[PDB]
Amino acid sequence: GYISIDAMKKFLGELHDFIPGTSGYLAYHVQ
Amino acid sequence: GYISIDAMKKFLGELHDFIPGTSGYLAYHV
Amino acid sequence: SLKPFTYPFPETRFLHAGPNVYKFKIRYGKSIRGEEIENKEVITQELEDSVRVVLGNLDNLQPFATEHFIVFPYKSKWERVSHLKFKHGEIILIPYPFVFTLYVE
Amino acid sequence: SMSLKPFTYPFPETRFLHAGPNVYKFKIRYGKSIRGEEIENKEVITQELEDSVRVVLGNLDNLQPFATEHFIVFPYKSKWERVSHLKFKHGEIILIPYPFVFTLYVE
């Protein structure tokens, strides 16, 4: 009784795993 | 596992069925 | 004191709380439909409790478990409401602009 | 096909995702039924989960549950607390964290 995923809008653009230490990605704290 | 309803904030005030034609309720269009 | 919910059949309920009128929809999942409950007073109370939790967390809907159900609340835009006017006597009631659907599983 | 590393079904996980100038925080959770039983054709499942993530990103302002071939997905947002105390970078570019965490309750 739920809507099918195939009837939904979907973001189809570029999507990457954010993995610190790889592919130029870094994360850290502030203050 | 989902959080128990008993752990959640609850609106405890007055809560009524909105039924036009009863208790003074009315609804209509333009 | 709310009228009994029509478990296990889906329903739309209009509820007056404070200065607003809210539109609620109740839907039941595959499992809870196949099995039926005989003492519906307990179930009606759990559904009122579920409505009151949603009204108490309008800005942070989250799923939760009652004694018999998992409730997944969702809001959607209340369409074609702008041309409607609600009154309680001379009092103007404001429709809350989102329908709340309780997916009961 | 799939731009993301496979999801670790049926184990819950947290994933950070980069799209354009933004970074998103996602959590995947599996329910009792789908958790106890495991399925060998995980490629189909992994594709369905990426598809589900992309649907959520495609409906950021109107989350609704939906059904895949094997799952019902109930997506929810919650405030990403202390996101102001985090800094995400792609090279020298500052990525803007989306201020809500997405939880997909997969049932």
Side-chain angles (χ1 to χ4, degrees), chain C residues 74-91:
Chain C
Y74 280 84
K75 58 171 51 171
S76 58
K77 180 164 186 302
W78 187 353
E79 310 287 2
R80 290 198 80 170
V81 69
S82 62
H83 292 86
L84 299 175
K85 197 163 174 180
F86 298 146
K87 292 195 174 179
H88 182 210
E90 296 188 6
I91 299 156

Side-chain angles (χ1 to χ4, degrees), chain C residues 57-99:
Chain C
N57 297 269
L58 291 168
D59 298 335
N60 186 36
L61 295 184
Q62 301 293 336
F64 52 89
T66 70
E67 182 178 8
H68 299 87
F69 312 120
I70 307 303
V71 178
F72 298 89
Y74 280 84
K75 58 171 51 171
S76 58
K77 180 164 186 302
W78 187 353
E79 310 287 2
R80 290 198 80 170
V81 69
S82 62
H83 292 86
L84 299 175
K85 197 163 174 180
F86 298 146
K87 292 195 174 179
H88 182 210
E90 296 188 6
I91 299 156
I92 306 297
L93 304 181
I94 298 300
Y96 189 82
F98 292 87
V99 175

Side-chain angles (χ1 to χ4, degrees), chain A residues 1-3, chain C residues 30 103 105:
Chain A
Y2 294 93
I3 185 175
Chain C
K30 295 281 180 178
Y103 296 93
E105 288 286 339

Side-chain angles (χ1 to χ4, degrees), chain C residues 5 14 17 25 37 80 87:
Chain C
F5 291 88
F14 297 87
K25 298 173 68 181
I37 297 175
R80 290 198 80 170
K87 292 195 174 179

